Design a protein around this nucleic acid. Structure first.
Lengths: 120, 93, 145
RNA sequence: GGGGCCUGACUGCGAGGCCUGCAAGCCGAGCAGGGGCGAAAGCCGGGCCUAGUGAACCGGUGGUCCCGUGUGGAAGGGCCA
RNA sequence: CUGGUGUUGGCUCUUGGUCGCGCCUGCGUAGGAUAGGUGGGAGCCUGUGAACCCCCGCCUCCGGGUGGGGGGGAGGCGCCG
RNA sequence: CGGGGGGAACCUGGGGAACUGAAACAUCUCAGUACCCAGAGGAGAGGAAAGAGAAAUCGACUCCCUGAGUAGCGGCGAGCG
RNA sequence: GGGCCCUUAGCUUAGUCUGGUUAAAGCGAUCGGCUCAUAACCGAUUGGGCGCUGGUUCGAAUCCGGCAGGGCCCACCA
């Protein structure tokens, strides 16, 4: 139709309109990463920076990178969600106005995405 | 004129004319080119309500309009007849 | 502009209901035609004061109407009708089932308010139920002489 | 007139005078700081000189020992430019 | 003279700016083909019925992209290249 | 049962000038003065804190003395206070 | 001195916010046919360091900042 079944049942374990913590999130990464391999946790985040700025990721202001696997303890995935949130907040340009951590969503290589908060 | 509920009437106010840039912003300030006396009248309208048999009407500052129907309500506790919407209005409080 | 209703209207209706409109509408239509009134404390409370007084008023026509449930339903009917064979002599209706039903020991009944139909007029045994909300079931006795 | 380094077209002052109704205007040795040129003595607080200009008020920027309406901070002032 | 409001209410027709969200959109060389970026990335797809054909609608760089439905039936697809 | 009309000033309320001063003049001044009007009374007004404002403070209102030509207001002018 | 509109081959619209791609046009003269003229009347011609110094990227008219050009209006002026 649009998506599969190994993903169609994962949409049942995530609220379409809800923010989560780095605990209930790094935990929900285990049940949505139902792939025959080590699913990868990728924390995607929208930034509050200008794309066509030489002194201020991609050319649309959306950075992202993986920092965990689908088999890593629910607490070992809560160490890099705080370490990847502090790694970025460590490079916010001078004249970069607008909520930097604009939009953060954590998903796996395959499984669905859960919009989580980077401060809890 | 005057509101039959609140007794609001036209007050007197001036008509100040400033010029220049507000010190707040650019600078120097504003200067008054002319002050003039004038009135501010209430926004009063006409309110026709039934109450009893007769009609009855009100010159009431729009702001208080509701207070008109507040009376038309508690007006059903009094004995208002004798063909006279002049005494019925008088009556209302 | 909260406003209690009356004649149920479209996109806003059903008596005693409170739906806010625009002063303009209420002020020059609803109140003028008696199709609603100001949702004032005055009325607004006098609403519930008539909302309960009809629920607790109906809670007496289905409460004392239910004391008649567990009483004259099981304590079956004992009717000594003057029948004979396969067709009684005096059928059976309120004028019968009820009438004598009263005699038994003081049973007050209704003319058609039960499960009435045609007057029995057929010797055998039948059983009907009271009415309504939620009513009580009681039997009959097609006696013979 | 020509050239080689240079920026004293410094900051903090300023004895004592010229001129003068007021307020403006002009000249100024010398002391302190830190400098430039010169081997040195020394010279430099713009230009051979006399014009190239505008009191206060009100505001703008830049700072800064200051004041900040009970207190903290702000708001807005003051002082220097 | 004029806009915004108050007095100022019902009913539909069509419409903008926004944020939600759900879908789509991208066709210079070449490349199987109409490649939005960038990261994840070796597995999903299929009995939530895949390969194949017809009707049908939208977009269209007229090349196709793609949604619905009956039939149908156990096969499509990525690395590699 | 009351009102109506009068009263030399005084009093409160609703309205409210210009000459003049600024050595012109428009903000400002004269001035909430003159005057018109309604009302009160031997007085009228005000009056028991949604106050004052910096004191472990005072404690209705009114009047006189100070505070004080202070604090301030001001084409930071005249002047107002 | 306060801002807010704007900057290619002669003139004067471009394309540029949606880079790895073709800069085209009218006017302008020249050259040819031209007819027994001229708007030529067709034609063929015929050019852009894309203001400039620089950044990113294999790439810049196009996206990255650091300065000027006018034509625009706003407004203030002790």
């Amino acid at each position: 139709p649009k998506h599969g079944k190994r993903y169609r049942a994962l949409l049942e374990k995530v609220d379409p309109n809800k923010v989560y913590t780095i605990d209930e999130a790094a935990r929900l990464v285990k049940e949505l990463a139902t792939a025959k391999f080590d699913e990868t946790v990728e924390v995607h985040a929208k930034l509050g920076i200008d794309p066509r700025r030489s002194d201020q990721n991609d050319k649309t202001g959306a950075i992202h990178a993986p920092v965990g696997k689908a088999s890593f303890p629910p607490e070992k995935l809560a160490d890099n969600i705080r370490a990847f949130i502090r790694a970025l907040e460590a490079h916010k340009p001078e004249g970069a106005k607008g909520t930097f951590l604009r939009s953060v969503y954590v998903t796996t290589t395959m499984g669905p995405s859960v919009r989580i908060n980077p401060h809890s | 004129k005057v509101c039959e509920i609140s007794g609001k009437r036209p007050i007197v106010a001036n008509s100040i004319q400033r010029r220049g840039k507000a010190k707040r912003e650019g600078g120097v300030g504003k200067k008054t080119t002319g002050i003039s006396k004038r009135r501010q009248y209430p926004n009063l309208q006409k309110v026709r309500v039934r109450v009893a048999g007769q009609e009855i009407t009100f010159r009431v500052a729009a702001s208080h309009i509701p207070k008109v129907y507040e009376l038309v309500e508690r007006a059903k506790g009094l004995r208002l007849e004798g063909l006279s919407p002049k005494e019925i209005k008088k009556e209302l409080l | 502009m909260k406003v209690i209703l009356l004649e149920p209207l479209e996109n806003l209706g059903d008596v005693g209901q409170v739906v806010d409109v625009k002063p303009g509408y209420a002020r020059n239509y609803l109140l003028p035609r008696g199709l609603a009134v100001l949702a004032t404390e005055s009325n607004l409370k006098a609403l519930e004061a008539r909302i309960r007084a009809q629920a607790k008023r109906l809670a007496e026509r289905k409460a004392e109407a239910e004391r008649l449930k567990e009483i004259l339903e099981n304590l079956t009917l004992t009717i000594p009708v003057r029948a004979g064979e396969t067709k009684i002599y005096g059928s059976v209706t309120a004028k019968d089932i009820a009438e004598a039903l009263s005699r038994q020991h003081g049973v007050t009944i209704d003319p058609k308010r039960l499960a009435l139909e045609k007057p029995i007029k057929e010797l055998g045994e039948y059983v009907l139920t009271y009415k309504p909300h939620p009513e009580v079931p009681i039997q009959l006795k097609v006696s013979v002489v």
